[PDB]
Design an enzyme around this catalytic site. Structure first.
Site: not given
Ligand SMILES: Nc1ncnc2c1ncn2[C@@H]1O[C@H](COP(=O)(O)OP(=O)(O)NP(=O)(O)O)[C@@H](O)[C@H]1O
Ligand SMILES: Nc1ncnc2c1ncn2[C@@H]1O[C@H](COP(=O)(O)OP(=O)(O)NP(=O)(O)O)[C@@H](O)[C@H]1O
Ligand SMILES: Nc1ccn([C@@H]2O[C@H](COP(=O)(O)OP(=O)(O)O)[C@@H](O)[C@H]2O)c(=O)n1
Ligand SMILES: Nc1ccn([C@@H]2O[C@H](COP(=O)(O)OP(=O)(O)O)[C@@H](O)[C@H]2O)c(=O)n1
Ligand SMILES: [Mg+2]
Ligand SMILES: [Mg+2]
Lengths: 643, 643
Positions: B331, B333, B335
């Site tokens: 995604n 970021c 994570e």
């Protein structure tokens, strides 16, 4: 350099394989291939290869560079092959009709528009030039559905007219956020970027009461912030009569967001005025001096040639499609005037008649005459061709198929009006040119409606014919409240149309002919020559005359180069020549507009009226616009050209 | 300045009317309004307004500027009102659960991610932070359907991870034209422009065998042609093990267009290697020196902080979602590691536990201890909250609803790891910090799976649970082939999960906590402090210590300003302090990576591992990447920060 036998050429194109990928890549449809193989001897022997020399160097190079089909970067098609491929692509199993179209095109009586020339006879035969698209809904979903549809249409050939009157303006409320709309310009930038990605060619239509109008009209300016411009798109104004009245009165004008003033684009004329002045009185919008807008519009036109000007009320009052609903746009070149809606994208297939073809010296004593009977017969042929294209066309989007099959509009046009007058020794601004102009357009309109009525006796009228003006015996000129010139018998035709219907909701839309007129070697489309000298080629008719008078020398040639194509004020050239070979910069635009108005009574749709202003002033441009507007024109102006 | 009574505040927000348009604009849902009115006395009397002072100035200003609901530009909500609105927005009629969540959030035990804080309790409650979107199809239609979907997701709050491995590269064949694809960059520019229009925040995922890779990795460079850059999007590499092997061997690497080499992204590990080396041997692509790509990647990372690095095979081998299909992206970021497909857009709802909350001086003699039992209990609460969010969420697109309801993933994370170590007097790089790090993540993972298993006994397991690793008793650490640290009883839990199922396919995804950690006043998320001085505020723990030792003066303050937040080489400061308050630039990245690897055995999804390189060289960056890769990390690197 090229195989001679046509069926042999068809075989190569059909069997073609992309060597780099190993994918078979037929350049001929199953249909046309099977037709050609079952008829190879008739077909091969019909072609007259002598006819490849009917083209000029620049006409041939036009065909060679873009039109003739290529096998591995090499030209595979001869001009005669392209023409027979087109003929079969249109006519299919009707070998007879195919043969007639082959003969008439190969002799340069008429041609079809570029996409027909590109794609007729090929596996995805997208032959339509024009798409008019409704912005689906004032929402992210509708904007992005519309964007996908434009992308898919642009994948193929042909322009888009897109109306966007229904998009809320800068600062408008959005339910569910504290932020507001950033209006049209950001959304236009999205469309601009898609136009560039999918291998310009979009016109955008807006009514001038929209609150984003001042930025919209400036979208092609070659200065200012890069994020307020949309340089590959063309702005067009869809102008209500009331705007022109308020400007002329030096009155007020009110700007609305369509969310504050709903319905403005879904009515016209008197209903529009009533609804508009009511929203104006109720404080729903922002009032300005009409002339402040008017002035900004002329500034943009002076700088960029745009926005185009199309009169909304003239288009709607005088359209045979008026039983469908309110028409909200024209197209990329301002000739097409057809109904569009979220579920219906109007389409049109185009062809042009070569006007000089019908000149015959036939007579007693060396005078040329014009053969109107033959013009009438060729226009019937072309009308039948365009109707066939509708049925054999591959539609890029379902909205286009649904529109075309329902209303079946077509668009006949012309090229070589200038050549015709020149060959007949008629100055463009003469009384005889004025008359011939009216007679030519009377016969093409008569011919097309007659062919179309015959098609309706064979196949039924188009689906939405009942309730149309034509169903009530109201033809184009009647909607201008004019009697026809009467070289053809209109009563008998109108009788037949009322009884039998017509197959096509619309037939005439004189178009620019930008590439097709170059292929044939004629001037363009109802426009005067722009110069007599276009690596430097002198007007053939002028050249002939200067040689005959024994005045053509290097001293002559230079005087043409140096005055860029003008012969006025050339010392020793007869006045008859100066009158005959006036450039468009040298003809009064009141004359241009008069002739446009004269022919328009026989034009179903509209026409792409470019205007040419020598030494442009705000005052001259204003009076040109108001003159066209009062003449009842639909297209007041396509491009403004200056210098 | 603000009404005190909560139900009174709810009433104002619910009755709100946009004065400028006269449109009612409720800022509270029917649901929550009816709940609050039926329970007003219980609700109003539960709020402890003293608790508004648990925030710092910059924490309050963070809330005030973006979080607290506004009536006509004026703050209408108190922090306690925001928290109770969130609690009811999550829990609905379950007043008891609501009250428990109110108390725990208001005391700063945990918080939910920004979109939950924005939208919980409101009419369109879009509470998810993360969307992972599959490029629908290698076609204009699929590209434009995907674009519409990103536009609609971006209208609401939360980032997009988008994988584009399936788009044909520059120069590839298109059936039906002589022209070719212009590849990824032009298509990326389309997405960039939509990101800007709909009020950045897209990460793009690509595997490094794609033939457009060299331009893709350079998309954020601040120089070069404006039409090769896409400055508001983030490139992320989805990296096969084979790439890393070829680079380390100094071997070859082959670039394919996905149309020449189909299926490469729909397999991983050994199957990928077999399929890849076969296409390589068959001359289907263009071979290069692997290290030439490797070098260009480090150049872009050095200049721009990007591309992100996520290991495709580690993500797929060690995912509980592996029964769904092959995972093709993370995604925004880095994570979230979830399955996506044209019909399924993975979503995730996020919350973080405040790690320092669990420190208690509780003991004999002034030592602080860590309360793991309470951490375990709060993590169960948060797990139950996140599961409720799934059911009460408004999904922007149908693809997101279908994915979330089927697999029910959630993502717990942390903030204040740095504060926790600092409060316990443990240097970040110590043996005790290493141990506490493992124990904290063991308990949060144990707690979440226990809560989730209890939910599955109440509601059934998630739809796709049968066939999952968890259904076979294989938990995250088992997929790393490690025994758990064993502070919690895993056998009994695994027994229960195998018998009863779990309600959620995934539970843990430590996230950046960029805004939520500021609201609470803690450092961030498992990362060391970046400086001890962030209009200039000195690390409160360091400040306390320097005052206690009687060394804090203007001479101290300047030495902190001047060395920007570092206390090393400050002359008269005890070594114990220097060890405790090392900046992240002062800690070895091998230590950072070791601790990331230690905690990762208890992390279902991945985590947003930023890397910080003091004096960066190609060699140092290479060894950081290869070290993480060999450690078995999923996210090798999120941003690279330097200087
Ligand atoms: N996030 C956004 N960024 C830019 N423009 C937007 C955004 N949201 C809506 N708009 C514009 O506002 C109009 C309405 O968009 P739409 O998707 O219908 O929003 P909505 O949430 O349904 N609110 P409303 O239309 O007021 O009921 C369109 O012209 C959009 O271009
Ligand atoms: N006119 C175009 N301009 C730019 N890119 C295009 C164009 N047409 C196709 N593409 C690209 O080529 C790919 C295929 O597009 P698509 O719409 O499927 O074309 P198609 O006509 O079906 N030919 P093919 O896909 O080869 O069977 C996508 O990656 C497109 O982005
Ligand atoms: N550059 C152009 C010119 C025309 N067109 C379309 O083709 C129509 C007729 O223009 P034209 O008569 O100059 O086209 P040709 O058939 O001569 O190429 C226009 O109304 C447009 O919709 C286009 O898509 N792109
Ligand atoms: N600027 C940002 C930051 C995060 N996000 C999304 O929110 C998720 C968590 O990031 P975060 O923990 O920094 O977000 P907050 O909840 O602290 O604001 C990311 O994985 C992104 O999908 C975003 O859309 N935009
Ligand atoms: Mg809406
Ligand atoms: Mg395709």
């Amino acid at each position: 350099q090229t195989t001679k036998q046509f069926s042999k050429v068809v075989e190569d194109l059909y069997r073609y394989v992309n060597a780099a990928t190993g994918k078979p890549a037929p350049m001929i449809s199953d249909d046309v291939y099977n037709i050609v193989m079952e008829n190879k001897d008739k077909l091969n022997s019909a072609i007259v290869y002598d006819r490849d020399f009917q083209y000029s160097y620049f006409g041939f190079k036009t065909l060679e560079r873009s039109y003739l089909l290529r096998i591995n970067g090499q030209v595979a098609e001869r001009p005669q092959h392209l023409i027979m491929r087109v003929a079969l692509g249109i006519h299919g199993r009707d070998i007879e009709a195919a043969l007639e179209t082959y003969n008439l095109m190969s002799l340069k009586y008429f041609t079809h528009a570029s996409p027909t020339l590109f794609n007729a006879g090929t596996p995805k035969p997208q032959m339509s030039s024009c798409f008019l698209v409704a912005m689906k809904e004032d929402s992210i979903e509708g904007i992005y559905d519309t964007l996908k549809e434009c992308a898919l249409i642009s994948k193929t050939a042909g322009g888009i007219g897109l109306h966007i009157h229904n998009i809320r303006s800068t600062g408008s409320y959005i339910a569910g956020t504290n932020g507001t709309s950033n209006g049209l310009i950001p959304m236009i930038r999205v469309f601009n970027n898609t136009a560039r990605y999918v291998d310009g060619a979009f016109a955008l239509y807006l009514e001038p009461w929209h609150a984003d109008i001042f930025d919209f009209i400036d979208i092609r300016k070659n200065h200012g912030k890069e994020e307020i411009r949309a340089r590959d798109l063309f702005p067009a104004l869809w102008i209500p009569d009331l705007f022109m009245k308020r400007v002329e009165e030096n009155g007020t004008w009110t700007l609305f967001s369509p969310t504050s003033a709903p319905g403005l684009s879904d009515c016209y004329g008197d209903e529009f005025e009533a609804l508009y002045t009511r929203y104006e009185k109720e404080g729903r919008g922002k009032t300005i001096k009409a002339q402040k807008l008017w002035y900004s519009i002329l500034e943009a036109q002076t700088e960029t040639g745009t926005p185009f000007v199309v009169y909304k009320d003239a288009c709607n009052r005088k359209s045979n499609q008026k039983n469908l609903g309110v028409i909200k746009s024209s197209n990329l070149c301002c000739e097409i005037v057809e109904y569009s809606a979220p579920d219906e994208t109007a389409v049109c297939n185009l062809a042009s008649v070569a006007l000089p073809a019908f000149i015959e010296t036939s007579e007693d004593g060396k005078t040329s005459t014009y053969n109107f009977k033959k013009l009438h017969e060729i226009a019937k042929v072309v009308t039948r061709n365009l109707n066939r294209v509708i049925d054999r066309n591959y539609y890029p989007v379902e909205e286009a198929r649904k529109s075309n099959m329902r209303h079946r509009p077509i668009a006949l046009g012309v090229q070589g009006l200038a050549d015709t007058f020149m060959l007949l020794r008629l100055p463009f601004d003469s009384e005889e040119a004025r008359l011939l102009n009216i007679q030519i357009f009377e016969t093409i309109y008569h011919a097309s409606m007659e062919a179309s009525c015959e098609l309706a006796q064979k196949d039924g009228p188009y689906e939405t014919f009942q309730g149309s003006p034509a169903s009530q015996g109201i033809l184009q000129f009647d909607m201008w409240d004019q009697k026809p010139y009467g070289m053809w018998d209109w009563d008998t035709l109108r009788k037949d149309i009322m009884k039998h219907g017509v197959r096509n909701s619309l037939t005439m839309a004189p178009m620019p002919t930008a590439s097709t007129s170059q292929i044939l070697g004629y001037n363009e489309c109802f426009e005067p020559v722009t110069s007599n000298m276009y690596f430097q080629v002198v007007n053939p008719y002028l050249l002939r005359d200067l040689v005959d008078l024994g005045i053509w020398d290097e001293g002559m040639k230079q005087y043409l180069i140096t005055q860029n194509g003008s012969i006025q004020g050339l010392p020793n050239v007869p006045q008859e020549l100066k009158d005959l070979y006036k450039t468009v910069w040298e003809i009064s635009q009141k004359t241009i507009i008069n002739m446009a108005a004269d022919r328009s009574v026989y034009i179903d749709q509209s026409h792409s009226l470019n205007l040419f202003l020598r030494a442009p002033t705000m005052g001259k441009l204003t009076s040109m616009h108001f003159y066209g507007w009062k003449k009842g024109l639909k297209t007041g102006m396509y491009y403004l050209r200056t210098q």
